[PDB]
Amino acid sequence: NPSNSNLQALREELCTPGLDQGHLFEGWPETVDECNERQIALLTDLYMFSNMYPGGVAQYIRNGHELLARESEEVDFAALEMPPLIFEAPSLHRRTAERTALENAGTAMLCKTVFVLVAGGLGERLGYSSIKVSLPVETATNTTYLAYYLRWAQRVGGKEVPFVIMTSDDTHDRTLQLLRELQLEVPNLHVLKQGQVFCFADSAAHLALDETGKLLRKPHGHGDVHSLIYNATVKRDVVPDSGDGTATAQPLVNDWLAAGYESIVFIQDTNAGATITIPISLALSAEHSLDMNFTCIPRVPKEPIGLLCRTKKNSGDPWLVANVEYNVFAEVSRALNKDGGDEVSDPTGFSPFPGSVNTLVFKLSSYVDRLRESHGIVPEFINPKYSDETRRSFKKPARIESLMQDIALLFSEDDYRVGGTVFERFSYQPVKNSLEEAAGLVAQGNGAYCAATGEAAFYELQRRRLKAIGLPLFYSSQPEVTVAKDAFGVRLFPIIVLDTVCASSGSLDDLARVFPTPEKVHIDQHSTLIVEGRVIIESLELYGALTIRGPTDSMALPHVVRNAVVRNAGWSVHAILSLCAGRDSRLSEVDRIRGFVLKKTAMAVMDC
Ligand SMILES: O=c1ccn([C@@H]2O[C@H](COP(=O)(O)OP(=O)(O)O[C@H]3O[C@H](CO)[C@@H](O)[C@H](O)[C@H]3O)[C@@H](O)[C@H]2O)c(=O)[nH]1
Numbered sequence: 015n016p017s018n019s020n021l022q023a024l025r026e027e028l029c030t031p032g033l034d035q036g037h038l039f040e041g042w043p044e045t046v047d048e049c050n051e052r053q054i055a056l057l058t059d060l061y062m063f064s065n066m067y068p069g070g071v072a073q074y075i076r077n078g079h080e081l082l083a084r085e086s087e088e089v090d091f092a093a094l095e096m097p098p099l100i101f102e103a104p105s106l107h108r109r110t111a112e113r114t115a116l117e118n119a120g121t122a123m124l125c126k127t128v129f130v131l132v133a134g135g136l137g138e139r140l141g142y143s144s145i146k147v148s149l150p151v152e153t154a155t156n157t158t159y160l161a162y163y164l165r166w167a168q169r170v171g172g173k174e175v176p177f178v179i180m181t182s183d184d185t186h187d188r189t190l191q192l193l194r195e196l197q198l199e200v201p202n203l204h205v206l207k208q209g210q211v212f213c214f215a216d217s218a219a220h221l222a223l224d225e226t227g228k229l230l231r232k233p234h235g236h237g238d239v240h241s242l243i244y245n246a247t248v249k250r251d252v253v254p255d256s257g258d259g260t261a262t263a264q265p266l267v268n269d270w271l272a273a274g275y276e277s278i279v280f281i282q283d284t285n286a287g288a289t290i291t292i293p294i295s296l297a298l299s300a301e302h303s304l305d306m307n308f309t310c311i312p313r314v315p316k317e318p319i320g321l322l323c324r325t326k327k328n329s330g331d332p333w334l335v336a337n338v339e340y341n342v343f344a345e346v347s348r349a350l351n352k353d354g355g356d357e358v359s360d361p362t363g364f365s366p367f368p369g370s371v372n373t374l375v376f377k378l379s380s381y382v383d384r385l386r387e388s389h390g391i392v393p394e395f396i397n398p399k400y401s402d403e404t405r406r407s408f409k410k411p412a413r414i415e416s417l418m419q420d421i422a423l424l425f426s427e428d429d430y431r432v433g434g435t436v437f438e439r440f441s442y443q444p445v446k447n448s449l450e451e452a453a454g455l456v457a458q459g460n461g462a463y464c465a466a467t468g469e470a471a472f473y474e475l476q477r478r479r480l481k482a483i484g485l486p487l488f489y490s491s492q493p494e495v496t497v498a499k500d501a502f503g504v505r506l507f508p509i510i511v512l513d514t515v516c517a518s519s520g521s522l523d524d525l526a527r528v529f530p531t532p533e534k535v536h537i538d539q540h541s542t543l544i545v546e547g548r549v550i551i552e553s554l555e556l557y558g559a560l561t562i563r564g565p566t567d568s569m570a571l572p573h574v575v576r577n578a579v580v581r582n583a584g585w586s587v588h589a590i591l592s593l594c595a596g597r598d599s600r601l602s603e604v605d606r607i608r609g610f611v612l613k614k615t616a617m618a619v620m621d622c
Contacts, residue, residue, distance in 0.1 A: 018046040021057040066209035078219035081396040093326040099433030107478040120293025124170035128278040132236040134182035146283040169514040208238040213411035222411035237416025241390030280374040284445040295375045305380035308434035313369030321367040322434045335432035337419045384424045443471040453501035465608035470504035484532040489539035497609025509542045516545045548572040558584035559617040583616035
């Protein structure tokens, strides 16, 4: 496609005033026909950047200039208030009539929901060299986040549930490898890889080169999903899929709407609470006719999560319900000395506005309308990392970024209802920080949000849900293992893990189908109970570790467990000692990032 004439034209265009990329061509011959392979390759990289970015490298440089201009200024909002449409979600551990009605409504709507997972990000910050969706949700069964999300979606929306995964050059191959290794067969899964974008060596938007004289590339952010969704097409067989000149053959959102789907949900890579959040949010979206629903928790003022606010950036601008990122809100709080009030905004211990968890719930029709109008394009930003305190020198080359929640900026208050649902903080269980960062954050009285806290929170969530339906679990709240040089402790036991065949959607009703007489099931605080397949447990006395396996098919007749008594050594947990020799280390980085290992000393199995 790119001829030598067009490559020379682009080179001349990029050397013009306002673009000033002549440093890319130092010592090069005048003509393209006289240039060698590495130069042709660099011009071709510049030329075909236009395929993945609107307007190509020249428009990328102009946008960079606009964004670095905007970033040099102190951000100001004309008006910043509580969103009009805020709704308080009921407790996930209380089986109230409202909770039952919302869970059942949400579970019904999950049959008509599209799921999107943003998994383009690296997790090297954790000390984990592999992809984040490969992390286990818990080490009792070692179920990956990828498997957890896909199996839950296929359980609530059938085998042919529409599922989208955004990948990157860093995660794509390994994501597909994991799908193969887990032997996960998802007929309507679409894996869309986001393209990296060029970087700016300086504040004048001069394109950066790497160590080998090639154009440095960096992620454009999780805002890439919408455009990736907008340009996505599908083709099957014996179906009316006309190849339009836009692309062959049919737009993917067209196939969704034609199939009868009514909602779309966006989730992130390492937050299991989404399976508890999504159904309630969906029900509340239907009850209050929300076009877009932000999943929110009460925010502590020192928290690396954004805040959902009603905003007007300029005095003439209309009201916009949108997310303000943590850094921007810190800068805004430092300013506005005479903003109106007596004392600092903290009368309850939490930020005035709720914290956005970035589990987004859209009405599919409204989402498609705004996606078609915007082509998936969302407002961009840039946030360079400077070396000196004031000197405008970049420590690392910078890149334009985007946020997938910023699509809310395309939703006018006149035509659309945009709101937020506030859940308990315990429902937000991400794995974002390493053990060192977690110890540092705990020293300041903040949330760890590490692998050990994520696994412990998963076990506690299962225990709280089961107690909500009357399972009499008596256990201590004292930690059983200290991690990160005795900085903080977590507890894991009792461990109770039910698979998607057993627990179905994970609703309280579905859990009550597994324990129809919960007063006759006595699980000791040190016990482990793994349940796989179609199992019903009527009566059980468990002192140790037990795996109950049932039929892998959901509609198969269930294995019923009555009057069972199991006693064995069961499992323990111990911390990873600093004095570990490291030779014959069966200790992987999965063990090392949580700071403990489970000893599976004994385990009973009931099959059939
Ligand atoms: O180019 C990118 C960058 C990120 N991600 C994914 O985006 C998600 C979130 O990235 P992460 O670095 O964990 O979070 P932030 O982008 O820093 O913060 C987001 O998530 C917070 C909740 O964890 C919210 O409070 C913020 O508003 C929201 O921007 C993860 O699943 C990443 O894999 C991509 O897929 N591609």
